[PDB]
Amino acid sequence: SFERFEIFPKTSSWPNHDSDKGVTAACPHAGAKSFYKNLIWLVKKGNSYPKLNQTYINDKGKEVLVLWGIHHPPTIAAQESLYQNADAYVFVGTSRYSKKFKPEIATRPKVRDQEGRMNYYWTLVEPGDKITFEATGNLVVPRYAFTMERDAGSGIIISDTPVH
Amino acid sequence: YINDKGKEVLVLWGIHHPPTIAAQESLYQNADAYVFVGTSRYSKKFKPEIATRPKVRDQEGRMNYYWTLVEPGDKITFEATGNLVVPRYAFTMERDAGSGIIISDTPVH
């Protein structure tokens, strides 16, 4: 079983932050700048990035796959222009997964005309468990989570053969 | 600790991550504490991760448990400004070729 649901609604979960300017030219969509559909890049809302705390409780009877991202800007000026905290930190916590991520602000070789980077992390939340997001900055919040129930196991086929 | 026995010594310790900064000063009074555990082969500096986590057994913080094997003639050094669960008992071992762990309810005879 694999269904996608809105773990955090865009219209009610982030009132104190900006969820509309997180678009870049590294992900074109019909020419205009865009971003991932299942993720939201939160930026400052007018020179203010208050501490963000959110949580989700797994009311489903199956597992939920939750994906998020940590952004590493190229320069300190970019970090202040996007979040304005300099010394930001992210923390994601479940009953088993606890981890703190601090941004690495440095200039990397250009890939897709991007000096900064974005690490993507995933976790599986069990029924009854909860996932907590804390963030002073540099966090790409989940917008869609995947409620899944898994089978015994299989593989991935890399072929150009048609499907019938 | 210097390993004067002729066998290996398993040493276990822990690093505590409190939920709030206030708890950190309530227990260790240093805010920016650090730990360092070192051998001739092992060397690691631990920093507390102070954040609130989903409650497990009515606990907001966590305790990460680490272990190391000190060879004969070697020494293990603990340095800590705070957030250290020190060893009290270590285990001297001489190890066999290798076996397994059986999970069963069969009686032992």
From TrEMBL, chain A:
Q: Could you name the domain of life of the organism this protein comes from?
A: Viruses
Q: Molecular function (GO) terms listed? A: host cell surface receptor binding
- One GO cellular component term: host cell plasma membrane
Indicate whether Membrane appears among the record's keywords. Answer: yes
Compartments where located: Host apical cell membrane
Which GO terms fall under biological process for this protein?
clathrin-dependent endocytosis of virus by host cell; fusion of virus membrane with host endosome membrane; fusion of virus membrane with host plasma membrane; virion attachment to host cell
Provide this UniProt record's keywords sorted from A to Z.
Clathrin- and caveolin-independent endocytosis of virus by host, Clathrin-mediated endocytosis of virus by host, Disulfide bond, Fusion of virus membrane with host endosomal membrane, Fusion of virus membrane with host membrane, Glycoprotein, Hemagglutinin, Host cell membrane, Host membrane, Host-virus interaction, Lipoprotein, Membrane, Palmitate, Viral attachment to host cell, Viral envelope protein, Viral penetration into host cytoplasm, Virion, Virus endocytosis by host, Virus entry into host cell
Q: Name the major location.
A: host cell
Q: What does this protein do?
A: Binds to sialic acid-containing receptors on the cell surface, bringing about the attachment of the virus particle to the cell. This attachment induces virion internalization of about two third of the virus particles through clathrin-dependent endocytosis and about one third through a clathrin- and caveolin-independent pathway. Plays a major role in the determination of host range restriction and virulence. Class I viral fusion protein.
Annotated family: Belongs to the influenza viruses hemagglutinin family.
Q: What is known about its subunit structure?
A: Homotrimer of disulfide-linked HA1-HA2.
In Swiss-Prot or TrEMBL terms, this protein is called Hemagglutinin
Query: What gene, per UniProt, encodes this protein?
Result: HA
Parent sequence residues shown: 127 to 290 of 525
